[PDB]
């Protein structure tokens, strides 16, 4: 019951528009993880307390100008109103929860005097609702447009606001406390039919800048809402303009949809001796970024340069310094993580500071001690499943969704061999035997295959098809004879190397997910969606004892210590259980992985526990006695 101390945390969401946001004062960065926002000390990488409270993924963020109040919204199941939560950054408490938007809250924004909030929500809802922050009340609401709208922003005097469509319109909404209504005036685009993504208001509200999807910045003069010269004269940007921030000077830093940064001069100028203004000439074409830019935030105020924190859809936080004296951008990425959900992780035998975490299209070799990612190899568009080292450090085996098993080298990531058909579909479990000559594979078909890897060829030996469900896990014994396969049938099979046969089959009402040998092959520990951990006698097969731990949702991760005194358990919920082996007892930790945890392990030297959830996060814990 006692909470487990949480060491380092690696992972953040970049897919969210304008998600990465900085604190107005001092050292604090904050980004949304799966369904909980995470504070971090800007100075040193020491994780800060998380803010729980969301039922599902957070999909927007907003911070007051003073930095006292913070607002966030979530995306929910279709048909259930999503709620905005307002936190206090002095006392980290859920202060107000308000649910009006049907499906998802598209974006939020604070007033300059922090008196009001604005929430626009729903790819289908399309309703703008103004809230007051003093109490969880909503002032007035209005259906915005026919086509959907993306982002809103308040002015810097804050009677008014401006909103833009996804598709084809843009309005400025003024608020008067006489009717308690919102009066819109739509912009006068001469003939342009652009698709807007992001908008930012100036430091003095004279213009606004909206990034179209066509790839150009559009400057809109305010008050008459009349459009003004367009963005980069030297062609557009390679994708839709997706990120925009305003330099404290008369400049705007725009991040295109394909990892491109540009500083744009905003002061107008007539050229060719004409009444016509020329296009905004870019004062500096910043260096490129690998990921699609989604979030830009101005971090620091320094007279010799300005630093910005830039998030990417590839989930790579960059710091960029802009020196206005000599026009150049220097970029250093400080953190990276997974973009999509991850599944499966691996440990090298009797080695500590290496991780093999593989999500969609990527294998990643992490260094545990510092969390600095070392090596990432990508197959373009494919889904990775069960990853596993070989007992000898050479091969890193990885299954894939197309049904091919591929083995890579840990250094240089050079693929050594591939099986152009391991299964008819995705393979879900792969295991290396101690002598590294045999390899066990299991796909969704439910067939367990064994492959003998020859020094230049790889051949298939007998393949058994006991299961009718997708094989969920495969575990081999110290000697090469024994391997157990856990599938969604509700059965676990024990096999025999010397004769490709089965001895017995463990049976449960619910599908078996994870299965682990006890050290020294005395017993088996199985966990499934029956919410019930089960001990089994390794030799003849029998239900020793059924523990009802974590009855509320399914349990899919079992890890066991090297001696076998403790047993780490993942769950369908967000908490990590730490049981003693001989007795059903708890030492668990609750607050982590806003999304369900999918795999967990303990380092061979018994110092740390490592967990990976259905959101792109890896949580290094501190191991202790049970």
């Amino acid at each position: 019951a006692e909470p487990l101390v949480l060491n380092s945390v690696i992972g953040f969401g970049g897919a969210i528009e304008n998600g990465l946001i900085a604190h107005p004062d001092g050292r604090t960065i904050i980004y949304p993880l799966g369904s909980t926002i995470v504070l971090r000390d800007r100075a040193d990488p020491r994780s800060q307390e998380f803010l729980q409270g969301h039922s599902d993924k957070v999909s927007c963020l907003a911070l007051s100008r003073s930095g006292r109040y913070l607002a966030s919204g979530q995306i929910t199941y279709m048909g259930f109103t999503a709620d905005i939560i307002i936190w206090d950054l002095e006392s980290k408490q859920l202060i107000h929860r308000m649910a009006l938007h049907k499906v998802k809250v598209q974006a939020l924004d604070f007033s300059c005097d922090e008196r009001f909030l604005a929430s626009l929500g729903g790819q289908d809802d399309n309703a703008l609702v103004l809230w007051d922050v003093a109490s969880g009340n909503a002032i007035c609401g209005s259906p915005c447009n026919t086509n959907f709208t993306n982002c809103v922003k308040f002015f810097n005097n804050s009677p008014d606001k401006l909103i833009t469509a996804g598709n084809f319109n843009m309005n400025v909404w003024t608020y008067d406390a006489g009717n308690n209504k919102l009066r819109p005036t739509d912009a006068t685009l001469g003939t342009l039919k652009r698709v807007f993504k992001s908008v930012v208001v100036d430091a003095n509200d004279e213009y606004a800048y909206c990034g179209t999807t066509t790839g150009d910045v559009l400057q809109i003069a305010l008050e008459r809402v009349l459009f003004k010269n367009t963005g980069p004269a030297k062609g557009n940007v390679q994708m839709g303009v997706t990120a925009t921030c305003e330099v404290p000077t008369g400049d705007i830093l725009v991040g295109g949809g394909d990892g491109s940064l540009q500083v744009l001069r905003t002061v107008p100028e007539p050229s060719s001796t004409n009444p016509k203004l020329l296009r905004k000439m870019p004062a500096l074409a910043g260096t490129k970024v690998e990921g699609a830019i989604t979030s830009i935030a101005l971090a620091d105020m320094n007279a010799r340069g300005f630093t910005f924190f830039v998030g990417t859809a590839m989930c790579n936080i960059y710091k960029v310094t802009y020196e206005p004296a000599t026009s150049r951008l220097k970029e250093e990425l400080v953190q990276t993580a997974h973009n999509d959900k991850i599944n499966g992780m691996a440990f090298p035998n009797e080695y500590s500071e290496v991780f093999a975490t593989c999500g969609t299209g990527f294998i990643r070799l992490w260094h545990l001690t510092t969390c600095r990612e070392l090596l990432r190899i990508a197959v373009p568009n494919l889904e990775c499943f069960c990853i596993a080292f070989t007992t000898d450090g050479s091969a890193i085996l990885s299954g894939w969704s197309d049904g091919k098993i591929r083995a890579f080298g840990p250094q240089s990531g050079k693929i050594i061999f591939t099986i152009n058909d391991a299964h008819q579909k995705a393979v879900t479990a792969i295991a290396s035997t101690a002598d590294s000559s045999r390899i066990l594979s299991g796909g969704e078909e439910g067939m367990v295959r064994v492959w003998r890897i020859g020094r230049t060829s790889q051949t298939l030996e007998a393949s058994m098809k006991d299961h009718k469900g997708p094989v969920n896990c495969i575990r081999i014994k110290g000697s090469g004879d024994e391997c157990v396969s856990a599938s969604s049938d509700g059965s676990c099979i024990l096999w025999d190397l010397h004769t490709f046969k089965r001895r017995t089959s463990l049976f449960a009402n619910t599908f078996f997910k994870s299965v682990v040998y006890h050290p020294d092959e005395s017993q088996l520990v199985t966990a499934g969606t029956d919410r019930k951990v089960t001990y089994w006698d390794a030799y003849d097969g029998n239900a020793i004892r059924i523990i009802d731990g974590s009855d509320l949702d399914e349990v899919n991760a079992l890890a066991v210590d090297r001696d076998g005194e403790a047993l780490v358990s993942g769950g369908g919920d967000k908490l990590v259980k730490l049981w003693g082996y001989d007795e059903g007892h708890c030492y668990f930790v609750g607050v982590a992985h806003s999304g369900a945890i999918t795999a967990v392990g303990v380092t061979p030297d018994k110092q740390r526990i490592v967990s990976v959830g259905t959101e792109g996060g890896i949580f290094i814990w501190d191991y202790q006695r049970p």
């Binding site: 060719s272 001796t273 016509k276």
Partner: protein, 62 residues
């Protein structure tokens, strides 16, 4: 070799100003005044190349 030369005047000018989007050179409109009334004829000569470079002090010295 065009059968009718003026057949392109409208479309070609409209294309450069709008289709291609290139900046249209819009000069030599000084003194034209309004329509309905005579443009004051300037004494300038169109053909003459009155560059007459003056690098008074920008000339380097031998």
């Amino acid at each position: 070799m065009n059968g009718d030369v003026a057949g392109s005047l409208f479309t070609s000018t409209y294309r450069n100003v709008k289709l291609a989007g290139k900046a249209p050179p819009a000069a030599n409109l000084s003194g034209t005044g309004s329509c309905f009334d005579t443009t004051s004829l300037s004494p300038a000569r169109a053909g003459a190349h009155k560059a007459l470079d003056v690098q008074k002090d920008e000339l380097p010295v031998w």
